[PDB]
C-alpha cells in the first residue's frame, strides 16, 4: 500500500524533471559559445565593454535573433594551460593582440614574439584540433603614429620586413601612407604563416584589422561564426 503510493510519488517526479530537461534542451541547443583569449595590455577590456552596451566573466548578447554566450578568463593567469581542455566544444576562439607593441620589450624578446609563440602553442594543441580562431589586431592608430614620422624602425626588431613587398591583392583604406599598410600586412602575414603551416583543412583563421573605437566588431563576430558553421556543414557532406 505505502509501496504503491511512494513509487507512484517517485514516478511523477522523474516526469516533472524530464519535462524541465526537454524544455531546457532547446535553449541549450540554440545558443553559441565563444572563448575570449589574449595577451596582456591588448585591449580586451575596452572591446568587451563596448560589446556589452546595447575569476570569470560572462556576457550574453543577441544579434538577429541568435544567442551568443562569450567567456573571458581573467582569474586564471598562468603560463601553463590545463583548464583549456574544457573549451573543446566552442564555436570559435577570439584572439586579441596589440599590433603596435613591436618596440616594447617586457628584459624580454619583443612582445609580438611572445604573442606569436602563444598563437603557435594554441594552434597545435591536441584538444583544439577542430576549433577556428578569429584574430583581432588591436591598436590600429598607435601603429600608424609610430610608423609615420617615427625614429624607431621595425627592421632592428623584425629583420625580415626589409626584404618584403606589399601584396598585389591588398585593398588600402582611403589616403593611407604606403608604408603603414606594408607594416600591417607584414604583421598579418607573420600570423597567416603559422595558421597555414599545419591547417590540414580542418580549421582556419580569420584575420581582421580592428581599432578600439570601431563599432563593427559585433557584425564581424556574427559573420565569421556563420561562415565557420557553413564550412563545417559543407565539409561534413564531402563537398569541400
Amino acid at each position: 500500500e505505502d509501496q504503491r503510493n511512494e513509487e507512484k510519488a517517485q514516478r511523477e517526479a522523474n516526469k516533472k524533471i524530464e519535462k524541465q530537461l526537454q524544455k531546457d534542451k532547446q535553449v541549450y541547443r540554440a545558443t553559441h559559445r565563444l572563448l575570449l583569449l589574449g595577451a596582456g595590455e591588448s585591449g580586451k577590456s575596452t572591446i568587451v565593454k563596448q560589446m556589452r552596451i546595447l575569476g570569470i566573466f560572462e556576457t550574453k548578447f543577441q544579434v538577429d535573433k541568435v544567442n551568443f554566450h562569450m567567456f573571458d578568463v581573467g582569474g586564471q593567469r598562468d603560463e601553463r594551460r590545463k583548464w583549456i581542455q574544457c573549451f573543446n566544444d566552442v564555436t570559435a576562439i577570439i584572439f586579441v593582440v596589440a599590433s603596435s607593441s613591436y618596440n616594447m620589450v617586457i628584459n624580454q624578446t619583443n612582445r609580438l614574439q611572445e604573442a606569436l609563440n602563444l598563437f603557435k602553442s594554441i594552434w597545435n594543441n591536441r584538444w583544439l584540433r577542430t576549433i577556428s580562431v578569429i584574430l583581432f589586431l588591436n591598436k590600429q592608430d598607435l601603429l600608424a603614429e609610430k610608423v609615420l614620422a617615427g625614429k624607431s624602425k621595425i627592421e632592428d626588431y623584425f629583420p625580415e620586413f626589409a626584404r618584403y613587398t606589399t601584396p598585389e591583392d591588398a585593398t588600402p583604406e582611403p589616403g593611407e601612407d604606403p608604408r603603414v599598410t606594408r607594416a600591417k600586412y607584414f604583421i598579418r602575414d607573420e600570423f597567416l604563416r603559422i595558421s597555414t603551416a599545419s591547417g590540414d583543412g580542418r580549421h582556419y583563421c580569420y584575420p581582421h584589422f580592428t581599432c578600439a573605437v570601431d563599432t563593427e566588431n559585433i557584425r564581424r563576430v556574427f559573420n565569421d561564426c556563420r561562415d565557420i558553421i557553413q564550412r563545417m556543414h559543407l565539409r561534413q557532406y564531402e563537398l569541400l
Binding site: 532547446q26 541547443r29 540554440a30 538577429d64 541568435v66 601584396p167 591583392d169 597567416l192 604563416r193 595558421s195 597555414t196 582556419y204 580569420y206 556563420r226 561562415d227 558553421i229 557553413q230 564550412r231 556543414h233 559543407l234 557532406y237 564531402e238 563537398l239 569541400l240
Partner: protein, 285 residues
C-alpha cells in the same frame, strides 16, 4: 542453359539487395552514436528498399522464368500494389534527404530549430501515407483497368498477370512519383553547388598565396546514378500509352528491371562516412 543463366543472376541480385539494406538497418539500430535526425530518412529508405527486394523481386523473377503466373488474380493485384508502393516510396525519401541537406547548408543558424525528431517522424509518415494512397487505393479498386480487348481477355484469365493501364493513371502516377521529385532535387543541388563554389572562392581569396574536384565528383555521382537508373522507364511509360504499337513488352520489362537495380546502390552512396565504416567493421566481425 539460358533459363538457368537468368536464374543465376536473379539470386545474386536478390542477395545483394537484401544484405546491404539489412546491414544498414542493424548498424543504425544497434549503435546509439548513429542515432541522428538525418539518419531517420536513411533508415526509412533502407526499409523501403528491403521491402522491395523481399517482396517484388523474387516473385517477379519466378514469373519471368516460368512464363506463367501460377497464383490467383488477387495475388497479382497485391504484387502490383506492392511494386507501385515501393517504387513511389523509394524516391520521395531521396527528395526529402536533398531538401534536408539544402536547409542544413543554406540556413546554418536555423537548422537546429527547423528539424526535430518529432517533425521527422511526421514527415516520414506523410511521405509513406502519400505513397500508399496512390498505390493500393486505385489498384484494389478497378479505376486503373483498361478497355481494349486484350486487357479484358487477360483479366478474365487467371494465368496471365500483365500490366495494362489507361492514359490517366499512367500519367498521374508518373508525375506524382518521378517528375515532381526531380526538379526539386535539381534546384536544391544547384544551390548547394553554388554555395560550395562561393565558399571555395572566399577561402582562395583569403589565403590563396600561401597554399570543384570534390563538389562535382559528389553531386554528379548522386544525381547521375538516380537519373540513369529511373529516367528511361518514366519516359517509355508515357510513350507506350500515347501511341500504341511503338514499344515492345520486352523493352518495357528490361527497363523496369533496370530500374530495380537502383535499390542496391543506395548504401554505397549514402552510407560512406567514416562513422558508418567504423561501425560496419565492428558489426561484421
Amino acid at each position: 542453359v539460358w533459363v538457368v543463366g537468368m536464374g543465376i543472376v536473379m539470386s545474386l541480385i536478390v542477395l545483394a539487395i537484401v544484405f546491404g539494406n539489412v546491414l544498414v538497418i542493424t548498424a543504425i539500430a544497434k549503435f546509439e552514436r548513429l542515432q541522428t535526425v538525418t539518419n531517420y530518412f536513411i533508415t526509412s529508405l533502407a526499409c523501403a528498399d528491403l521491402v522491395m527486394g523481399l517482396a517484388v523481386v523474387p516473385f517477379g523473377a519466378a514469373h519471368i522464368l516460368t512464363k506463367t503466373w501460377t497464383f490467383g488474380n488477387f495475388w497479382c493485384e497485391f504484387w502490383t500494389s506492392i511494386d507501385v508502393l515501393c517504387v513511389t516510396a523509394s524516391i520521395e525519401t531521396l527528395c526529402v534527404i536533398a531538401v534536408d541537406r539544402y536547409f542544413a547548408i543554406t540556413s546554418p543558424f536555423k537548422y537546429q530549430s527547423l528539424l526535430t525528431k518529432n517533425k521527422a517522424r511526421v514527415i516520414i509518415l506523410m511521405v509513406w501515407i502519400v505513397s500508399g494512397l496512390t498505390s493500393f487505393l486505385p489498384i484494389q479498386m478497378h479505376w486503373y483497368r483498361a478497355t481494349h480487348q486484350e486487357a479484358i481477355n487477360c483479366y478474365a484469365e487467371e494465368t496471365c498477370c500483365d500490366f495494362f493501364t489507361n492514359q490517366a493513371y499512367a500519367i498521374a502516377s508518373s508525375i506524382v512519383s518521378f517528375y515532381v521529385p526531380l526538379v526539386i532535387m535539381v534546384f536544391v543541388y544547384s544551390r548547394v553547388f553554388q554555395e560550395a563554389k562561393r565558399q571555395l572562392q572566399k577561402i582562395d581569396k583569403s589565403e590563396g598565396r600561401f597554399h570543384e574536384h570534390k563538389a562535382l565528383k559528389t553531386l554528379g555521382i548522386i544525381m547521375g546514378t538516380f537519373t540513369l537508373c529511373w529516367l528511361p522507364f518514366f519516359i517509355v511509360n508515357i510513350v507506350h500509352v500515347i501511341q500504341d504499337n511503338l514499344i515492345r513488352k520486352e523493352v518495357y520489362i528490361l527497363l523496369n528491371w533496370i530500374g530495380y537495380v537502383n535499390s542496391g546502390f543506395n548504401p554505397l552512396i549514402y552510407c560512406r562516412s567514416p562513422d558508418f565504416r567504423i561501425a560496419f567493421q565492428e558489426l561484421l566481425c
